[PDB]
């Protein structure tokens, strides 16, 4: 699966 961290 993909994966996004928004911080
Ligand atoms: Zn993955």
């Not at 699966?1 to 911080?7: A, I």
């Amino acid at each position: 699966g993909s994966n996004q961290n928004n911080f």
